[PDB]
Amino acid sequence: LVRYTKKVPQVSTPTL
């Protein structure tokens, strides 16, 4: 994943 976090794209993720 490049748009989301290194881990599973859950409710908690980076909003680039």
Short mmCIF file of all heavy atoms in Angstrom, two decimals:
data_model
loop_
_atom_site.label_atom_id
_atom_site.label_comp_id
_atom_site.label_asym_id
_atom_site.label_seq_id
_atom_site.Cartn_x
_atom_site.Cartn_y
_atom_site.Cartn_z
N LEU A 1 0.83 -1.20 0.00
CA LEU A 1 0.00 0.00 0.00
C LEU A 1 0.87 1.26 0.00
O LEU A 1 1.84 1.35 0.75
CB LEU A 1 -0.93 0.01 1.22
CG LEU A 1 -1.82 -1.22 1.39
CD1 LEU A 1 -2.22 -1.40 2.84
CD2 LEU A 1 -3.05 -1.12 0.50
N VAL A 2 0.51 2.22 -0.85
CA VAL A 2 1.25 3.47 -0.94
C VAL A 2 0.40 4.65 -0.49
O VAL A 2 0.92 5.66 -0.02
CB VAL A 2 1.73 3.73 -2.38
CG1 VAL A 2 2.89 2.81 -2.73
CG2 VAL A 2 0.59 3.55 -3.37
N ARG A 3 -0.92 4.51 -0.62
CA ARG A 3 -1.84 5.56 -0.22
C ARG A 3 -2.29 5.38 1.23
O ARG A 3 -2.63 6.34 1.91
CB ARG A 3 -3.06 5.57 -1.14
CG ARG A 3 -3.68 6.95 -1.31
CD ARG A 3 -2.76 7.89 -2.07
NE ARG A 3 -3.48 9.01 -2.66
CZ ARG A 3 -2.92 9.92 -3.46
NH1 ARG A 3 -1.63 9.83 -3.75
NH2 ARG A 3 -3.64 10.91 -3.96
N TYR A 4 -2.27 4.13 1.69
CA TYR A 4 -2.68 3.82 3.06
C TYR A 4 -1.47 3.47 3.92
O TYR A 4 -0.32 3.65 3.50
CB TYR A 4 -3.67 2.65 3.06
CG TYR A 4 -4.77 2.79 2.03
CD1 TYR A 4 -5.15 1.70 1.25
CD2 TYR A 4 -5.41 4.00 1.83
CE1 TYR A 4 -6.15 1.82 0.31
CE2 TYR A 4 -6.42 4.13 0.89
CZ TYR A 4 -6.78 3.03 0.13
OH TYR A 4 -7.78 3.16 -0.81
N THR A 5 -1.73 2.98 5.12
CA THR A 5 -0.66 2.61 6.04
C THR A 5 -0.03 1.27 5.65
O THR A 5 -0.64 0.48 4.92
CB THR A 5 -1.18 2.51 7.49
OG1 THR A 5 -0.07 2.36 8.40
CG2 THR A 5 -2.14 1.34 7.65
N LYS A 6 1.18 1.02 6.14
CA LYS A 6 1.88 -0.22 5.85
C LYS A 6 1.02 -1.43 6.19
O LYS A 6 1.11 -2.47 5.55
CB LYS A 6 3.20 -0.27 6.62
CG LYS A 6 4.27 0.66 6.08
CD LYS A 6 5.07 0.00 4.97
CE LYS A 6 4.40 0.18 3.61
NZ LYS A 6 5.38 0.09 2.50
N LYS A 7 0.19 -1.28 7.22
CA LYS A 7 -0.69 -2.37 7.65
C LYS A 7 -2.03 -2.30 6.92
O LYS A 7 -2.22 -1.48 6.02
CB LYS A 7 -0.91 -2.29 9.16
CG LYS A 7 -0.71 -3.62 9.87
CD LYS A 7 0.64 -3.67 10.58
CE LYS A 7 1.78 -3.86 9.59
NZ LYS A 7 3.08 -4.04 10.27
N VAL A 8 -2.95 -3.18 7.31
CA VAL A 8 -4.27 -3.22 6.70
C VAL A 8 -4.94 -1.86 6.75
O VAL A 8 -4.96 -1.19 7.78
CB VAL A 8 -5.17 -4.26 7.39
CG1 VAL A 8 -6.54 -4.30 6.72
CG2 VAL A 8 -4.52 -5.63 7.37
N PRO A 9 -5.51 -1.43 5.61
CA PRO A 9 -6.20 -0.14 5.50
C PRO A 9 -7.51 -0.12 6.28
O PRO A 9 -8.59 -0.34 5.72
CB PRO A 9 -6.47 -0.01 4.00
CG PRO A 9 -6.51 -1.41 3.50
CD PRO A 9 -5.53 -2.18 4.34
N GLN A 10 -7.42 0.15 7.58
CA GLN A 10 -8.60 0.20 8.44
C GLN A 10 -9.03 1.64 8.69
O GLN A 10 -8.51 2.57 8.06
CB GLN A 10 -8.32 -0.50 9.77
CG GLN A 10 -9.44 -1.43 10.21
CD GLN A 10 -9.23 -2.86 9.74
OE1 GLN A 10 -8.24 -3.17 9.08
NE2 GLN A 10 -10.17 -3.74 10.07
N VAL A 11 -9.96 1.82 9.61
CA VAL A 11 -10.46 3.15 9.95
C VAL A 11 -9.31 4.09 10.30
O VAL A 11 -9.39 5.30 10.07
CB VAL A 11 -11.45 3.10 11.13
CG1 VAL A 11 -12.78 2.52 10.69
CG2 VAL A 11 -10.86 2.30 12.28
N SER A 12 -8.24 3.53 10.85
CA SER A 12 -7.07 4.32 11.23
C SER A 12 -5.98 4.23 10.17
O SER A 12 -5.30 3.22 10.04
CB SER A 12 -6.53 3.84 12.58
OG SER A 12 -5.32 4.51 12.90
N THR A 13 -5.83 5.31 9.40
CA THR A 13 -4.83 5.35 8.34
C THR A 13 -4.46 6.79 8.00
O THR A 13 -5.20 7.73 8.28
CB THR A 13 -5.32 4.64 7.07
OG1 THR A 13 -6.74 4.77 6.95
CG2 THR A 13 -4.94 3.17 7.09
N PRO A 14 -3.28 6.97 7.37
CA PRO A 14 -2.79 8.29 6.98
C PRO A 14 -3.60 8.89 5.83
O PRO A 14 -3.93 8.20 4.86
CB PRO A 14 -1.35 8.02 6.53
CG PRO A 14 -1.36 6.58 6.11
CD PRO A 14 -2.35 5.89 7.01
N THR A 15 -3.92 10.18 5.94
CA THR A 15 -4.69 10.87 4.92
C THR A 15 -3.81 11.82 4.12
O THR A 15 -3.90 13.04 4.26
CB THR A 15 -5.86 11.66 5.53
OG1 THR A 15 -5.43 12.30 6.74
CG2 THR A 15 -7.04 10.75 5.82
N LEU A 16 -2.95 11.26 3.27
CA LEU A 16 -2.05 12.06 2.45
C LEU A 16 -2.84 12.95 1.49
O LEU A 16 -3.58 12.46 0.64
CB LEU A 16 -1.11 11.15 1.66
CG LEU A 16 -0.14 11.85 0.70
CD1 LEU A 16 1.01 12.47 1.47
CD2 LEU A 16 0.37 10.88 -0.35
#
